[PDB]
């Protein structure tokens, strides 16, 4: 640009508000648009989600992605689940002067999809030697540009301009005369693959997600029992590999309180959470499976310090309204239930499915915040572990170095006010048989909890 | 980094302090309010709508040899002249993050026993404000300070017209007869106000 003063204006919603967020979430989204069969990270930006996967609320990508985005997650790891049968919108444009109408240019959508991309080419009224190439999505204009008649420039100009993130031109053959005038020629042949998603296809996303790391995983708004059991085993497997993934689920729409509570009781893993209530958001219903996305995002976003014991959700109304007795049963069953209070939908008590046992010390394990606190410490120690496994001499000075590292790391948690007391020391028992990466250590800490209930007694 | 700039305008001088303000700057702020008592209730605080003039003060020394520099005697004469200036001064303090029109309330120099060339300075500023003494309707507020100065004599340019000179150099633009009615302007200008030439020197009033 030339030297001088330049200025622009933006809506406050366009502010770079991504600063200060926390947490990582995963999703096997169904999407009409964007990359297929791969994980992609989004930095909590609505436009980024819009550009990467469109804005079709009918598709689980934008719908659930918006909810997770509203949950204030630092990073969302989206996977475009697909059925197969994948295709990209495509079209071939032809030359005028050849009486055979030689095909010279092939256009194609940037990503597979089924949306109605259309092309309209008309004679450039200023100069017939050029022509105006206007790219359409349905009746809406999407990009316009005039172009020279030579084929190579036309493919270049289409691929050149900024507004062609949707379509990429390709040359089939050379010719001298401009393309034929046409109006709203659809890029037929495409397919988003959302049709008839198989139960098995979810498993591809799971294995792809494993190489990545994330704080929690939530299904794509689906309450199929097979997927839940499959994901239950999958998350349990990843725990044995050291990857502590927190799973969020929601029962089927037609499940009553009896079905939901039995489902929560049936699997009482502390890494699993059942949503026992649908919810409203601008007149659009969200099934308990769908709501679990927002619940997962809020829990992940709160991180360590915060909790959702009484967080005011974005939702506007919850269809199943429960009495205190019904709430007590659902809460006792490990069901996570949203309650309507004075125009506000509020999550209650931060519970997870682990409520059957609560064997003394395991009482704390029934709450999501406690488990999130535990998992994060394991991840942090695992990170520090891999810097030293078979890479530092297993001597007393080296072991003291490791303890100093761990002890200082916990001392940061003291600085956050998360923990009231902590201790980390040499595990003298397991130290009797040490090896290069088999030095062993022990610790225990006292997490500070969020205030949950108050009892008052008015003496009079 | 800290710097102090005094941008006088009625004298087009952009003074930059050679020396930072010694020990510490400080600016107060005090809400304009009055206290009233009520029988059987006690005291109460009533805010008064108007704002309050607040002061900035510090002290320095004008060194003889140091980055741009000038003699301390001339600098003291410069500031002492500015003390009597009715028009306001623009004070900017980089590190302190202060920027606003002010006027020098008090000024004092001093020659210590040694260091006879230097002059220890103690200066005080006051926040400056302006007094802006049909078909009622909402319009833009008159918040902009009008601190801008021009020469008392104008050299007419090629494209200029007497109305245009009045608006650019005297505000409303309909003020042109004030320029014309001055006999010196009448002498240099032709008897037709509408006709003017590049060069002619013209004297705006005041």
């Amino acid at each position: 640009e030339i030297p001088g003063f330049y200025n622009r204006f933006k809506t406050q919603a366009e502010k770079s508000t991504n600063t200060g967020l926390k947490g990582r979430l995963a999703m096997p989204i169904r999407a009409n648009w964007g990359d297929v069969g791969k994980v992609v990270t989004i930095k909590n930006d609505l436009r980024q989600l819009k550009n990467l996967f469109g804005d079709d609320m009918n598709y689980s990508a934008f719908k659930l992605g918006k909810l997770a985005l509203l949950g204030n997650v630092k990073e969302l790891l989206l996977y475009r689940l697909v059925d197969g049968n994948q295709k990209k919108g495509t079209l071939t444009l032809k030359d005028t002067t050849e009486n055979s109408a030689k095909d010279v240019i092939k256009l194609e959508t940037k990503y597979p999809t089924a949306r109605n991309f259309n092309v309209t080419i008309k004679s450039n009224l200023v100069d017939s030697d050029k022509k105006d190439f206007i790219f359409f999505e349905n009746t809406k204009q999407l990009f316009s540009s005039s172009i020279k008649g030579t084929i190579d420039e036309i493919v270049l100009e289409i691929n050149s301009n900024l507004d062609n993130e949707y379509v990429i031109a390709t040359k089939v053959a050379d010719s001298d005369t401009i393309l034929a005038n046409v109006v709203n020629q659809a890029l037929e042949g495409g397919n988003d693959g959302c049709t008839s998603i198989t139960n098995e296809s979810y498993l591809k996303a799971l294995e792809e997600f494993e190489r990545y790391s994330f704080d929690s995983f939530v299904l794509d708004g689906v309450a199929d029992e097979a997927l839940q059991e499959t994901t239950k085993a999958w998350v349990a497997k990843n725990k044995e590999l050291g990857k502590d993934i927190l799973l969020f689920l929601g029962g089927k729409t037609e499940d009553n309180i009896k079905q939901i509570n039995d489902k929560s009781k049936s699997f009482n893993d502390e890494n699993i959470v059942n949503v026992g209530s649908s919810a409203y958001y601008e007149n659009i219903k969200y099934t308990p499976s769908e709501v679990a996305v927002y619940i997962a995002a809020l829990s992940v976003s709160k991180g360590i310090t915060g909790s959702i014991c009484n967080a005011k959700t974005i939702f506007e109304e919850v269809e199943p309204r429960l009495s205190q007795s019904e709430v007590k049963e659902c809460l006792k069953s490990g069901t996570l239930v949203l309650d309507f209070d004075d125009g506000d939908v509020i999550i209650v008590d931060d519970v997870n499915t682990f409520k059957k046992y609560v064997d003394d010390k395991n009482e704390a394990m029934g709450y999501i915040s406690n488990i999130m606190f535990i998992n994060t410490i394991n991840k942090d120690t695992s990170l520090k572990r891999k810097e030293f496994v078979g890479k530092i001499f297993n001597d007393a000075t080296g072991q003291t170095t490791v303890i100093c590292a761990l002890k200082k790391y916990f001392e940061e948690l003291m600085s956050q006010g998360i923990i009231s007391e902590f201790n980390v020391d040499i595990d003298t028992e397991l130290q009797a048989t040490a090896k290069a990466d088999e030095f062993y250590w022990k610790w225990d800490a006292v997490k500070v909890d969020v205030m949950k209930k108050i009892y008052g007694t008015g003496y009079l | 980094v800290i710097d102090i700039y005094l941008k006088n305008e009625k004298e087009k001088i952009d003074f930059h302090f050679p020396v930072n303000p010694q020990d510490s700057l400080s600016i107060k702020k005090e809400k304009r309010f009055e206290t009233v008592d009520i029988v059987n209730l006690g005291e109460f605080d009533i805010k008064k709508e108007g704002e309050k003039i607040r002061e900035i003060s510090f002290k320095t020394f004008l060194p003889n040899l140091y980055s741009e520099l000038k003699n301390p005697i001339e600098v003291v004469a410069m500031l002492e002249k500015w003390v009597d200036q009715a028009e306001p001064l623009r004070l900017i303090i980089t590190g302190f993050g202060y920027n606003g029109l002010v006027t020098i309330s008090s000024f004092s120099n001093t020659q210590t026993a040694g260091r006879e060339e230097d002059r220890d300075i103690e200066i005080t500023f006051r926040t400056y404000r302006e007094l802006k003494i049909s078909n009622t309707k909402t319009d833009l507020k008159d918040n902009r300070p009008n601190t801008q100065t021009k020469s008392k004599i104008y050299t007419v340019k090629a494209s200029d017209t007497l109305y245009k000179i009045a608006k650019n150099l005297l505000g409303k633009g309909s003020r042109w007869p004030e320029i014309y009615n001055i006999p010196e302007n009448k002498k240099v200008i032709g008897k037709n106000p509408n006709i003017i030439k590049k060069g002619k020197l013209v004297i705006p009033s005041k």
Partner: protein
């Protein structure tokens, strides 16, 4: 590297133009009340020069009532240090000096009667620079 130092044996002192050869110690310093003030933007303090004050101490062995008779009258002290290994000599004179206290009486046991004089001097002149 070479030996070109100086020794107090070479010291020659003229108290008011009179060789007070019996003084076996002398020292005079010319100090300045350097003001130190701290500036807002500069991390390190700024030191500003000030007025100078001359002090001198002079002690020797008593041989007469010269200093007691002298009193607090102003006088001059010319100090000459001469290099003997090589030619050249320093020569200083304290321009205007006065006693701060008369060592009126001092003596102890069988020791020699030492005398100690302390005072101040307004200014000085450097007459030779080696």
């Amino acid at each position: 590297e070479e030996a070109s130092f100086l020794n107090g044996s070479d010291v020659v002192i003229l108290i008011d133009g009179v060789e007070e050869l019996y003084m076996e110690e002398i020292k005079a310093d010319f100090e300045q009340d350097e003001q130190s003030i701290k500036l807002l933007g500069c991390q390190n303090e700024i030191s500003r020069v000030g007025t100078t004050k001359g002090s001198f101490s002079l002690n020797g062995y008593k041989t007469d009532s010269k200093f007691a008779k002298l009193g607090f009258r102003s006088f001059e002290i010319i100090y000459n240090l001469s290099n003997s290994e090589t030619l050249g000599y320093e020569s200083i004179r304290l321009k205007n000096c006065r006693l701060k206290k008369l060592p009126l009486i001092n003596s102890k046991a069988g020791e020699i009667v030492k005398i100690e004089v302390e005072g101040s001097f307004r200014g000085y002149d450097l007459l030779n620079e080696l």
